[model samples]
Target: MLKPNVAIIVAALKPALGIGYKGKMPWRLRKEIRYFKDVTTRTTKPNTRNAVIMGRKTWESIPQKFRPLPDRLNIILSRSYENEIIDDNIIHASSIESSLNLVSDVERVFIIGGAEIYNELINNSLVSHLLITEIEHPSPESIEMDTFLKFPLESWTKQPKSELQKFVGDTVLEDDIKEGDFTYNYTLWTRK
Candidate 1:
């Protein structure tokens, strides 16, 4: 079977694709977290695991208990962390493409990022799928266009809304978690 290269997963708020503040997601949407987990962990068949790639900062940003995200293989991109011995499920690859070569039997590969990683891979066309959750906010500062982690949305085209919504809607049965007050919806984009 021919395994694909990458699938990008991100949560970016509008105006600036604002992803985080203070090294953490600015919003505390439990629904977003569950959505992230489902997108990265859901597989084609039973007992199959997906591989998630991110940068050193992204890895560090994750809480200790969730560092090695439960069912997925966590591959981090970092030159500094390359020398140290690491956990069984984590790999410190030097680049995104190189990291893609380090796994096996993965149900799928996903790029879960902090900002730079997504931009680089998207620019290089290394990512095939872009599973995004965009949050709606009334105030500009609600999920402001700060000078932080941003996913440039110019080069991608949205998947048909009907199909994309269906893809996201079906997952509700597995998890009915919803964001508190803040409105958000799923959007999958492809390289244009």
Candidate 2:
């Protein structure tokens, strides 16, 4: 039997493992965001879209202009008690277990996150892949926000550096741009 594949996608500028600054992505990397949509949207069958799970903050980060991505299923993890936001296509899962149960039928699940959501999912053994966009320089002004997920490269099976190049292409790599504290690269890993 084949187990479902779970992909955790994140882009961190500098520090190589943290993303987001003040609720919005720190930089206007339009190409990077497009690549994310491309890789994640490719599926074996037509009309099938990958499921995305994100924390409340991640959900909020979506601009009002792009509230819901077409064709994909969106799930927001919120601890809020009110169900005021109503949409048949949108579902809110209060807990991680409930979120897992809701998506049990999905064959490929992508955890598109805010830091707190990524922290909770990475600790679970079921997460099969970590797709990270590692930036070379850290933004000094942006580093003060909370980062809950800690990725120790030593614990993961790092795919060959070239593999990421072939898979994600040259556009995703942030070269020659230096932020105050870091340099960046995109990396993918699976459990060892």
Candidate 3:
């Protein structure tokens, strides 16, 4: 049973690979955010949990009240934080390899990130699956973005929507979810 050990989760603008601008996500979709919470926190095995890895900026990008992101182990990959002190609940690692090693006991691991972390991991080909929330903004040209993802979609294959739902252990919406000014769909892809 060669199941995937690590997965990548991200939301990028349609027609443009932009992910963040001014140090925050360009768009705010509560439904899309909820899906992120549900997929990352849900686990089939009783008493076991999943782990989410992110860079320092991504960690800070999360609201202070939701810092730990409950029910799952939060691993922060940071060279600076590794030297400083943080709450005992958060695990700080200096690099991608060390971060993955820290979550070795977890049922699953996800790379939830900002641009730098995603680029490094994807370039290194460390992730096995992708949980992409492809968004179609009303006007992509108007959206200002400074950060973008360099995903290697050429080396991946899109999985069936049912497979995505099964993997997340939830009933993901089959069609695109329309909210406010943008529309998006939850998609799953596996490394080829």
Give the TM-score of each candidate.
0.83, 0.74, 0.90
Task: Report the lDDT tens digits of candidate 2 across residue range 125-145.
Answer: 767788876665433554544
In candidate 3, position 125 carries an lDDT of 57
Worst 10 residues of 2 by lDDT: 81-90
For candidate 2, the lDDT comes to: 0.65
The residue-by-residue lDDT of candidate 3 on 72-161, one tens digit each, is 888888776553225545788787666555444578888899789888888655678889999997788899888888877898899998
Q: In model 1, how large is the Cα lDDT of residue 26?
A: 76
What is candidate 1's lDDT per residue for 1-192, written digit by digit as tens? 144657788876755567777677778887678888887888767877888888888888888887899888888888765433267687777876666565567877888886777777776665777887776666747553444444556777888776565655557622223465566777788777
In candidate 1, stretches whose alpha carbon ends up further than 4 angstroms from where it belongs are: 1-3, 81-87, 142-152, 165-169, 173-181
**Cα lDDT over the full model 3:** 0.81
* Model 2 stretches astray by more than 4 angstroms: 1-3, 81-88, 103-105, 138-148, 161-184
